[PDB]
C-alpha cells in the first residue's frame, strides 16, 4: 500500500484516468492530502463529488490557495520582506529594463517602491508598449495573491489610456496563474475585451486569459477564444497570441477544436502573409496542443502537406519536436542533427535524460564554435532550455565567451541564456560577470537591455524561486512550465523584431514556470512543524523550511517523524512515531 508511488507513476504516464482511479479508493485522509499537494504541484486539478469524505479540504489544497501564505511565512523566516529597487541590483529602453528588473526581483512578495499606492508617476515615465509592460509588472509582483492582487490592480482597469488598461488586463491574468481560485474572477473581468475594437486590448485580454487558464482545457474559455483567430479585424499578432493562449489552455490535451481551428487559420493565410514572423506563433500553439503525445502526431503531419513550402518546413519541424519533447528519443535527435527550431527541438527532446543532455551540450559547443553563421543564433537558447535554473560553470563560461560575438543576435541570445541558466540563484560568479559585461556593453542599448534582463533574472524572487520544469526527484515534467519556456524561447528566435520590437510582453510567459524551491513540513493538521534535515546532493544540517537547489536531496535527520511521501520536496506531511 503506497498510493503516492502509484500516483507518481501514473503522472509519469500522463494517464489521468488512472490518476483519478488511484486518488479515489485511498481510505486514509492524510495520504489524500499529501497526494493533493503532489497534484497541485504538478498542475493537475481533478473534480471530486461533494460527498467524498473531505471534499472541502482536498479541493482547497489542490487549488494552491494557501501557497501565498506559506511563501510569505518563509519570507518572514529569512527576513527578506524589504523591497529592492532596480538600482540596488546594478530613455524608454532603460525605463523598460528597470520595470522588468523590478518585477523579476520582487516577484511573489507583494511590495514595491515603484508601483507604490500611486503608480501613475512610474507608468507615465514610459511610453506606448513599454507602459503596457510596466502596468503588467504589477501583477507579477502580486503573484499568487489573487484577492490583494485584484484589489491593487482594479484602479487601472478604468484608465483612459489604452496601453495601461491592456497591461492591467494582462496583470489581472498573471495574478491568477497557478492558483486556480474558485471564483473565475479573471474570466469575468477579461472576457469583454477579447473582441474589443482595439487590437492592443485584445492582446492584453487574450494573453492574460491564456496565462490564467493554462492548466486546464476549459471548454468555455476555449469557446470564447477560438472565434478570435477567424475575426477579420484580428491582426496576425492577435491570431498568433490567440493560438498561444489556446495551446497553453489546451496543452497536451489533443483538443480537436483547437487543432481544426488552427489548421483553418493556416489554410486561409496567403503565401505572402505566412512570411510574417507572428505566424510562427500559429504552429507553436499547435505543437503545445500535442506536446509529448509522440507517434500520434503523424495524422496532423499529413494535413500540413498542403501548406506553402517555406512555412511547411517550420510548422512540420516545430509540431514534430513538440510531440516528442519529453521522449529523449535517440532517432529523432539523429534526424534533427527552420534550422533554429531544429536545434531547439534537439534540446527539447534531450532534456529528458542526462546522457543525451551531455551529448547535446557537446553538440551545442561545437555549433557555437564552428556552425553555420545563421544556425548559431539559436544555439544559446537551446543551452537555456537544457539548463534553466542550473548554474553549471562550463555552460556559463561558453555563454560568457560568446557574449561578445560580432553577430548581434548571437550576443543577445547568449546574454539572455546566461540570465536563464542562473535564474533564481544569487550566484556571485554570474552576478560579477553580468556587472562587467554591463560595463563592456555601455553605449550599446540592445546588449545593455539584455544585460539588465539577465541581471534581474538572476535575482528572481530574491533567490527563492526556480524556473526548472522538472520536480519530484527530477522525474515529472510540468507541461505548463514547458509551454511558458517554449513560448519565450520561440519568440527569441526573432529577438530583434519580437522582443526588441513591440511585443516584449511575451516575456511574462515565464510566469507559467515560476515555482517555489522551498521544503516545508506540516503535521497532519497542516500546521507548520519545524524538523531537522540533512540536505546533501547524492552535507550540512538545517531546520525546515529549507531552500533546496537544483540537484539536492534532503533526508530527515532523526527517526522521530515519518514522512507520508518518500520525496522531501515541496510540502510534506509528517506523522508521529
Amino acid at each position: 500500500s503506497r498510493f503516492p508511488e502509484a500516483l507518481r507513476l501514473a503522472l509519469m504516464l500522463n494517464d489521468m484516468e488512472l490518476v483519478e482511479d488511484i486518488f479515489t479508493s485511498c481510505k486514509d485522509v492524510v495520504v489524500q492530502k499529501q497526494m493533493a499537494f503532489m497534484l497541485g504541484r504538478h498542475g493537475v486539478f481533478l473534480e471530486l463529488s461533494e460527498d467524498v469524505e473531505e471534499y472541502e479540504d482536498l479541493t482547497e489544497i489542490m487549488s494552491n490557495v494557501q501557497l501565498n501564505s506559506n511563501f510569505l511565512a518563509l519570507a518572514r523566516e529569512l527576513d527578506i520582506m524589504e523591497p529592492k529597487v532596480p538600482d540596488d541590483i546594478y530613455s524608454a529602453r532603460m525605463n523598460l529594463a528597470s520595470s522588468f528588473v523590478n518585477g523579476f526581483v520582487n516577484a511573489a512578495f507583494g511590495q514595491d517602491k515603484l508601483l507604490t499606492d500611486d503608480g501613475n508617476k512610474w507608468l507615465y515615465k514610459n511610453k506606448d508598449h513599454g507602459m503596457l509592460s510596466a502596468a503588467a509588472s504589477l501583477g507579477m509582483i502580486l503573484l499568487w495573491d489573487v484577492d490583494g492582487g485584484l484589489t491593487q490592480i482594479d484602479k487601472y482597469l478604468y484608465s483612459s489610456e489604452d496601453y495601461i488598461k491592456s497591461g492591467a488586463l494582462l496583470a489581472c491574468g498573471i495574478v491568477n496563474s497557478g492558483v486556480r481560485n474558485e471564483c473565475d474572477p479573471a474570466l469575468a473581468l477579461l472576457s469583454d475585451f477579447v473582441l474589443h475594437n482595439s487590437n492592443t486590448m485584445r492582446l492584453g485580454s487574450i494573453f492574460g486569459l491564456g496565462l490564467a487558464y493554462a492548466g486546464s482545457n476549459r471548454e468555455d474559455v476555449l469557446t470564447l477564444l477560438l472565434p478570435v483567430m477567424g475575426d477579420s479585424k484580428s491582426s496576425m499578432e492577435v491570431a498568433g497570441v490567440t493560438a498561444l493562449a489556446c495551446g497553453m489552455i489546451a496543452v497536451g490535451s489533443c483538443n480537436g477544436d483547437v487543432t481544426s481551428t488552427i489548421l483553418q487559420t493556416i489554410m486561409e493565410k496567403s503565401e505572402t502573409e505566412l512570411k510574417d514572423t507572428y505566424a510562427r506563433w500559429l504552429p507553436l500553439g499547435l505543437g503545445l496542443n500535442h506536446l509529448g503525445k509522440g507517434e500520434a502526431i503523424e495524422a496532423i503531419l499529413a494535413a500540413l502537406e498542403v501548406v506553402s513550402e517555406p512555412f511547411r518546413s517550420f510548422a512540420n519541424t516545430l509540431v514534430d519536436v513538440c510531440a516528442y519533447a519529453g521522449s529523449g528519443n535517440v532517432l529523432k535527435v539523429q534526424q534533427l542533427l527552420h534550422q533554429g527550431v531544429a536545434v531547439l527541438g534537439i534540446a527539447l527532446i534531450a532534456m529528458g535524460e542526462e546522457i543525451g543532455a551531455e551529448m547535446a551540450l557537446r553538440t551545442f559547443g561545437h555549433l557555437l564554435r564552428y556552425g553555420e553563421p545563421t544556425l548559431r543564433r539559436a544555439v544559446p537558447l537551446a543551452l537555456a532550455l537544457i539548463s534553466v535554473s542550473n548554474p553549471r560553470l562550463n555552460i556559463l563560461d561558453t555563454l560568457s565567451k560568446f557574449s561578445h560575438d560580432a553577430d548581434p543576435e548571437v550576443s543577445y541570445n547568449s546574454i539572455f541564456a546566461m540570465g536563464m541558466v542562473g535564474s533564481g540563484t544569487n550566484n556571485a560568479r554570474l552576478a560579477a560577470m553580468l556587472r562587467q559585461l554591463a560595463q563592456y556593453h555601455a553605449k550599446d542599448p540592445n546588449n545593455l537591455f539584455m544585460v539588465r534582463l539577465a541581471q534581474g533574472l538572476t535575482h528572481l524572487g530574491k533567490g527563492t524561486l526556480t524556473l526548472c520544469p522538472y520536480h519530484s526527484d527530477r522525474q515529472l515534467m510540468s507541461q505548463v512550465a514547458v509551454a511558458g519556456l517554449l513560448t519565450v524561447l520561440v519568440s527569441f528566435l526573432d529577438v530583434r523584431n519580437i522582443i526588441l520590437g513591440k511585443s516584449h510582453y511575451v516575456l511574462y510567459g515565464l510566469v507559467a514556470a515560476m515555482q517555489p524551491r522551498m521544503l516545508v513540513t506540516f503535521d497532519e493538521e497542516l500546521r507548520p512543524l519545524p524538523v531537522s534535515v540533512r540536505v546533501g546532493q547524492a552535507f550540512q544540517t538545517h531546520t525546515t523550511p529549507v531552500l533546496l537547489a537544483h540537484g539536492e536531496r534532503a533526508e530527515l535527520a532523526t527517526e522521530e517523524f515519518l514522512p507520508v511521501t518518500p520525496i522531501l520536496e515541496g510540502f510534506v506531511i509528517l506523522r508521529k512515531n
Binding site: 518563509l74 527576513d79 524589504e82 556571485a428 530574491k462 538545517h542
Partner: peptide, 15 residues
C-alpha cells in the same frame, strides 16, 4: 540581503 545559513538561503550584497 545577508545570508542566512540555518535555512540554506544564499543572499547577495547590499548585504
Amino acid at each position: 540581503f545577508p545570508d542566512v545559513g540555518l535555512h540554506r538561503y544564499w543572499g547577495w550584497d547590499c548585504g
